[PDB]
Amino acid sequence: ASTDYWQNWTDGGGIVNAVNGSGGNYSVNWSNTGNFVVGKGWTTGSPFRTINYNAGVWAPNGNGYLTLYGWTRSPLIEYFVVDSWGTYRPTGTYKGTVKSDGGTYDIYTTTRYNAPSIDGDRTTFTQYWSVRQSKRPTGSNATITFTNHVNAWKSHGMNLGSNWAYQVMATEGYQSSGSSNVTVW
Template identity: 35%
Template sequence: MRIHSGFKAAILMTACSLVSCVSAQKSVDAQAAVVPGIEKFQAYTQVFPEKALITQNHATGHVGKFFFTHWKDAGAASLSLDATGAFSVSWQGGGYNYVGGPGWHYGDKNRVIGYRFEEDSGASYITLYGWGYDKAMPTSDPAHLVEYYILQRWTYDPSKDGVYGKTFVSDGVEYSTYRSVREVKPSINGPTTFYQYWSKPTQQRPLGQDHKIIFADHVKAWADTGWILPNMNNFDASDDPTYQVMAVEVFNPPKDGTASGRVWDATPR
């Protein structure tokens, strides 16, 4: 499971290897102007080339209209992605944790996420992943900060120790919900106690097909059991904005592997 530690120290290493640092900085300034408030997190304003290979330990930013995260605590894992939302995560076996993938720098209750995975050779899990945060709520209440997961594929079930909520159907797929609590753990707002919400399909989603995640259905299902998701579009946390990405996670992978696919915004217009 991911141990989150913020990305403010991420650098322009990959961007500067493919384009000039001056051009990259101009793109950074332009992106910050387009997204008022995001300049608080300088790493998030990075604009990478429209085809990028990310290999450093920590990196985040934008490729085209897509935001991405890329984080590992050791080992060898890389993320390649382009402006169409196509991406691939490659990893070597070892004792470390990696999480990364493309999406958006904020969550949207009404967003419909489209995706397709062509390859998955053993990721711990593939999931829609993000955060909600309410700075007005006391930090003593775990509901002030929520880390959420809508699982799609897995070799390890991270929801297995959670409290069951309900079972529901979204876009023809049956999901069950679970909630866990993290006691004083790293988060987008420093070490704190917070909830994790999970939606897990009865069957893993197959490769080689287009799929949809109707996010509003999951928000409602969580709320039906009193699990309210805080604001998913703010820059109030200390370390990161409330992003939403299609993430590939591997931890202590026993062998080398790859997961590849594409993500897009399928919200009806």
């Protein structure tokens, strides 16, 4: 499918060279950054969407995530489906696991306090996570059947908001350096 949304946010720290490529392709070169999120996807997320991607390059030197990323409103929720990471594997309050697209993911919940949200400014909100138990190999055509995660989260009392915001396959980093090249469809 054709992507219609380009996400390129940075808190201004360090260098974040984000390139909006042709079609669903994008690349990022970052160094000594603060927090940033870059990716391509859809303006309106959907719990029934099946995301396809191919990370031709995944080379974080420190803390960075290759993850499906999105938000919902009412309530405000930031969610993730992490397929790979750098030096740090994200975790939180363990809820259970879900098997999907050949891998096993741990389900976690966390809370952010006085942090920047999609609406701008700062606030306190909940984060939903699905983190692969082991890093998914990159360079191949990968699939993320989001419906499997949404259903698993629901079973653990993790319900998403009613107003859907953007949904993208992103590269997120925190105080690190690295390179990535991803194609989404």
